């Protein structure tokens, strides 16, 4: 097989149609399902796969207590075909408390980070064998995307960060070929803090929309050149900002170069993508907490920072139901590259005390050139019944 190139144009998108739902928490109340968080979707040439960071335990288990912590030695990257829930037959592809995965057209690359907070190791596993590794450079929680990496002509790119993720000092873009790190570029341009990037092929380059945990409620953007390893960065212009927390839409502002300095602290992993001057994006419906989820197009929102003209809104999860991380993934069609996204539906501790565990289900949506209706697809488990 030849390497992927993603050279087809982006599909026409009128909104997103429902694609898949794992029902993991509902199934957990009567079966052996893995405790997970930080899920993501990625697809090979034929099939989409669901990935998640396991907590080394099933949900109906003594070890599911205190599973709110994000880093432990037992976290492993789980991998299944999309829609197959994480049952005991699930493969642990690597040891990882932070990860990214992608298929280059020949084989899967997994970027797997584990070890001490102060001195972590990133392992590069390709075609089922460990090919390379790199140690923490800022000695303060080396971490990556928690979503798919992107490969063009066999050169995969992954965004990685360390410390408080400050600009060129902490964030690096690694260029990887068949698991070997071939180049490493420091972050460049005006993005001040860059974490948990959601990346999509935008041939000839890769584009990433990220989380700013310190200054912006507007999201950072990275443009990555595959041919010369050059890096450019900025923020999503849109006056309707994508991060959580953020200011109310009636009072929020944004900037194309700088963080908006409005509810800059903290964030949530999310996504956005360009459609000429317009921007498609998803965010939690609630402005201060991860409740509900909505997607919409903002007219001129990729280039005009004063624009707040939204259209094509869809509620994916109603404003009363818990959401979580969300990320883009790209699927190659017959004549165009489609954009799809997943929403993590987090349940349990800290916000729900009925249970001792923290875990997620997922719902997955794909861009459509056709027409669609309305709905709400929340997790749907009753923690009052599966109560401790």
């Amino acid at each position, epitope marked *: 097989a030849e390497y992927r190139n993603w050279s087809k144009p982006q599909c026409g998108i009128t909104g997103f149609a429902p694609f898949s739902k794992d029902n993991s928490i509902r199934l957990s109340a009567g079966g052996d399902i893995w405790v997970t968080r930080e899920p993501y979707v990625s697809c090979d040439l034929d099939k989409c796969y669901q990935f998640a960071l396991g907590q080394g335990t099933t949900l109906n288990n003594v070890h599911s207590n205190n599973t709110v*912590r*994000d*880093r432990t030695p037992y976290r492993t990257l789980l991998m299944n075909e999309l829609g197959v829930p994480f049952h005991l037959g699930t493969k642990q592809v690597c040891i990882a408390w932070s990860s990214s995965s992608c298929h280059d057209g020949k084989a899967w690359l997994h970027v797997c980070i584990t070890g001490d907070d102060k001195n972590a190791t990133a392992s590069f596993i390709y075609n089922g064998r460990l090919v390379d590794s790199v140690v923490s450079w800022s000695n303060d929680i080396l*971490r990556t995307q928690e979503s798919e990496c992107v490969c063009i002509n066999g050169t995969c790119t992954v965004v990685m960060t360390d410390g408080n993720a400050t600009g060129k000092a902490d964030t690096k873009i690694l260029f990887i070929e068949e698991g070997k790190i071939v180049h490493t570029s420091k972050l460049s341009g005006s993005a001040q803090h860059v974490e948990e990037c959601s990346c999509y092929p935008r041939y000839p380059g890769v584009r990433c929309v990220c989380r700013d*945990n310190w200054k912006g409620s507007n999201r950072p953007i990275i443009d990555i050149n595959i041919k010369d390893h050059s890096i450019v960065s900025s923020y999503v212009c849109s006056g309707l900002v994508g991060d959580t927390p953020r200011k109310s839409d009636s009072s929020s502002s944004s900037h194309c170069l700088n963080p908006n300095n409005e509810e800059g*602290g*903290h964030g949530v992993k999310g996504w956005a993508f360009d459609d000429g001057n317009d921007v498609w994006m998803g965010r939690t419906i609630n402005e*201060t907490s991860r409740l509900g989820y909505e997607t919409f197009k903002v007219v001129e929102g990729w280039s005009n920072p004063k624009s707040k003209l939204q259209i094509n809104r869809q509620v994916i999860v109603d404003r009363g139901d818990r959401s979580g*991380y969300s990320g883009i993934f790209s699927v190659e069609g017959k004549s165009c590259i489609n954009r799809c996204f997943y929403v993590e539906l987090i349940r349990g501790r800290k916000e729900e005390t009925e249970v001792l565990w923290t875990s997620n289900s997922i719902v997955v949506f794909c861009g459509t050139s056709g027409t669609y209706g309305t709905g709400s697809w929340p997790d749907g488990a009753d923690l009052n019944l599966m109560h401790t």
Partner: antibody
Amino acid sequence: QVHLVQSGAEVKEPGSSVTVSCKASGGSFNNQAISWVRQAPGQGLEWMGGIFPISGTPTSAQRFQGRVTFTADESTTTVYMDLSSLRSDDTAVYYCARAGSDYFNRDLGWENYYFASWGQGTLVTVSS
Amino acid sequence: EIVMTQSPATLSLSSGERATLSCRASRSVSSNLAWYQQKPGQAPRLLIYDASTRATGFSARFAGSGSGTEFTLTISSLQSEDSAIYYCQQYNNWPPWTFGQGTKVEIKR
């Protein structure tokens, strides 16, 4: 019992630097974050920053992000706060304090970052 | 980021009266609120955490209550030792950990 012992009062000239220390009376530090809070004369409390004594992740408020750094050592069982490029206005009592918080989650941030135990408060004064 | 407003600025009541102090966050802090007592010339001391759990150093006469955006500290039957600056402090999951400007308590003997 764990309680904090601080470095004696300090006198410094403007533009200089000061090292303030905070030592555990219990012979060891657990991973509960040691934080620095200051109090200018006749004014309220102001959090400057902190560090976890074992896991090492340091954190700083914007008004101190350039001027302040934190370091820790289990052998001396002491956390050291360095304040650099001092000014007359930084004349204040500097208290080290132990937060309930003992882990940083990449995603969710810090639980229990309330100060449970406080040091004697090193009076730092800046003048010619 | 989150601003803490505390009132009254100064409060004065006689011994045996019940004092009430109030604290308001600029945005909801989800019960991540603590209260501190500072007697003159000493380090602050934790009164309350998680908006209502009182610390080992204080008796049931100190009652913390409220949630979301507004909180209150009630001091039942005032005693001579209660004259101190009282401060609220939010710790809603992300820095900075901002304190209230403080309430002076003065016993009207």
